[PDB]
Amino acid sequence: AVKFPQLCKFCDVRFSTCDNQKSCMSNCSITSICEKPQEVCVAVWRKNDENITLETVCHDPKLPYHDFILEDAASPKCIMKEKKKPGETFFMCSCSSDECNDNIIFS
């Protein structure tokens, strides 16, 4: 009958030690009940000239995030996909199984 909310890591932007790895754990202790039942899990890994960050959120996949469309939302796993963005390296995934943005997979 009813779609229950996803559980997702939801630490927002965190500094990350994840670099030069095929996959990474989020190291986010916040597993959140998404506020809205259509939200899916998202992770964003970004490296600029100053630091590495990993962002974990719940997000409605019919809305853009960081100006991109979440095309992979049906995936049960967070497969990071590179996006081009001025002056940084940017990867993002979304996924729709509980805590799926806890295990960030680059390859």
The span from the CA of 46 to the CA of 32, in Å, is 22
Domains of the chain: 1-107 (2.10.60.10)
Please list, in sequence order, all residues whose beta carbon lies within 8 angstroms of the beta carbon of residue 63, skipping any fewer than 6 positions away. Answer: none
Give residue 44's identity as a one-letter amino acid code: V
For residue 45, give the nearest of 32, 28, 62, 63 by alpha carbon. Answer: 28
Positive or negative, the CA dihedral 82, 51, 26, 73 is negative
Rg of the chain over CA atoms, in angstroms? 13
The set of long-range contacts for 60-69, using a CB threshold of 8 Å and a minimum separation of 24, is: 60/36, 61/94, 62/38, 65/92, 66/90, 66/92, 68/92
